[PDB]
Paper text:
PNNs are a condensed form of neural extracellular matrix that include the glycosaminoglycan hyaluronan and extracellular matrix proteins such as aggrecan and tenascin-R (TNR). TNC and TNR share a common domain organization that includes an N-terminal cysteine-rich region responsible for the formation of disulfide-linked multimers, followed by 5-14 epidermal growth factor (EGF)-like domains, 8 to 9 FN repeats, and a C-terminal fibrinogen (Fg)-like domain. Here, we demonstrate that TNR and TNC associate with the single fibronectin type III (FN) domain found in RPTPζ and provide a structural basis of these interactions. Overall, our findings provide novel structural insights in the interactions between RPTPζ and tenascin family members, prove that the formation of a RPTPζ–TNR complex is essential to the assembly of PNNs, and provide a blueprint to explore a potential role for a RPTPζ–TNC complex in neural function.
Crystallization trials were thus undertaken with the FN domain of RPTPζ and the Fg domain of TNC mixed in a 1:1 molar ratio. The crystal structure of the RPTPζ–TNC complex was determined and refined to 1.89 Å (Rwork/Rfree = 0.164/0.205). The complex formed by RPTPζ and TNC is almost indistinguishable from the one formed by RPTPζ and TNR. The single RPTPζ-TNC found in the asymmetric unit superimposes onto each of the four complexes found in the RPTPζ-TNR crystal unit cell with RMSD values of 0.717 to 1.107 Å (313–316 Cα positions). It occludes a total of 935 Å2 with a shape complementarity value of 0.75. In the major contact site, R334 and Y368 in RPTPζ interlock with H2163, H2175, and R2151 in TNC, while Q369 forms five hydrogen bonds with S2164, H2150, C2149, and Y2140. Furthermore, the Oδ2 atom of D366 forms a hydrogen bond with the amide group of the N2148 side chain. In the minor site located close to the Ca2+ ion bound to TNC, V2133 is nestled against L329 and I374 in RPTPζ, while the carboxylate group of D370 makes hydrogen bonds with the main chain nitrogen atoms of A2132 and V2133. However, M342 in RPTPζ does not contact residues in TNC. Furthermore, the hydrogen bond between D366 and TNC residue N2148 (N1302 in TNR) is found in only two of the four RPTPζ–TNR complexes, while the bond between the side chain atoms of D370 in RPTPζ and T2134 in TNC (T1288 in TNR) is present in two of the four RPTPζ–TNR complexes. This contact with T2134, a residue that coordinates the Ca2+ ion, might account for the more significant effect that removal of Ca2+ has on interactions between TNC and RPTPζ.
Numbering used by the authors:
A (entry chain A): 1975 to 2191
B (entry chain B): 310 to 410
């Protein structure tokens, strides 16, 4: 911890010589008072990623209310959500890219977006995402510009309540091409862990991670 | 063709002149995929027999708000799926809604 004594993300932690995935303490804006323990993915395409969503076995409940999605929940070594307030503070300290890793029955795919940011609470955590590359298909472009929606705070573009109807929480529009906080193992139309351009709306994905690191890292 | 009928259609007046209608996705889709839904409605016992068609934006938002309806008038509506090749599926059962005075 010498180049960056208070690394502000997993990329600076990796530059300090931490090259094994696991739990690390980062410091938002390099501030020792703003410590945050995160899971770092240090192997995917060179590493240095903060993981902020993991689905892998359906043990954790992702049908949670606005306060839970603002604050985060779950064991960061297992299934978890980092929290929207954290995501805003991280994506505001610089320019970050998004990576999504997907696995299902021995097949894998990924998507990278060159630009990814989440607004603060007063924007209702508005999503900005653009610049797709990868193999999973560009499903997040549909969600660009949307505020976050939970079953108890409907901000989506639909007449109905997307989060209530499709048993999750997301930057819903009307309603989704991505539903990675949906109901685990649920192959009913649009209800599961969906990435539309990879497996459609009637196939729930076994494993999914969303992660971020500085652009051009 | 296209699909079986939308299920469990329900409708409640929202305000004095609007109606909120919801339904469930057809259980069976035959070949082509569902692209959107049509909400078909007309006055039940009124003189204006204009047949109205509201088309939804996409296939996931299983609800619609109908505006510009007349108080003290009954309406009949049906929901139907429309597939990517333009074909209409089976129509839902008719639902009669009475707007209050
Ligand atoms: Ca809504």
């Amino acid at each position: 911890g010498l180049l960056y004594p208070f690394p502000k993300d997993c990329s600076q932690a990796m530059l300090n010589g931490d090259t094994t995935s696991g739990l690390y303490t980062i410091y938002l804006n390099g501030d020792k008072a703003e410590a945050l323990e995160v899971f770092c993915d240090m192997t995917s395409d060179g590493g240095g990623w903060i993981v902020f969503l993991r689905r892998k076995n359906g043990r954790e409940n992702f049908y949670q209310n606005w306060k839970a999605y603002a604050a985060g929940f779950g064991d960061r070594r297992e299934e978890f959500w980092l929290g929207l307030d954290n995501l805003n503070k991280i994506t505001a300290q610089g320019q970050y890219e998004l990576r999504v890793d997907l696995r299902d029955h021995g097949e894998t795919a990924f998507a990278v977006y060159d630009k990814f940011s989440v607004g603060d609470a007063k924007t209702r955590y508005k999503l900005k995402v653009e610049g797709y590359s990868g193999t999973a298909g560009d499903s997040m472009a549909y969600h660009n510009g949307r505020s976050f929606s939970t079953f108890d705070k409907d901000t989506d573009s639909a007449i109905t309540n997307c989060a209530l109807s499709y048993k999750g929480a997301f930057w819903y529009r009307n309603c989704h091409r991505v539903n990675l906080m949906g109901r685990y193992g649920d192959n009913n139309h649009s209800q599961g862990v969906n990435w539309f351009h990879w497996k459609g709306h009637e196939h729930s994905i076994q494993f999914a991670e969303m992660k971020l690191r500085p652009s051009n890292f | 063709v296209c699909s079986s009928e939308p299920e469990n259609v329900q409708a409640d007046p929202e305000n004095y002149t609007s109606l909120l209608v919801t339904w469930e996705r057809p259980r069976v889709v035959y070949d082509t995929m569902i692209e959107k839904f049509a909400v078909l409605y007309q006055q039940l016992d009124g003189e204006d027999q204009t047949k109205h068609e509201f088309l939804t934006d996409g296939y996931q938002d299983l609800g619609a708000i109908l505006n510009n309806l007349l108080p003290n008038m009954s309406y009949v509506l049906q929901i139907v799926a429309i597939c990517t090749n333009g074909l209409y599926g089976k129509y839902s059962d008719q639902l009669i809604v009475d707007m209050p005075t």
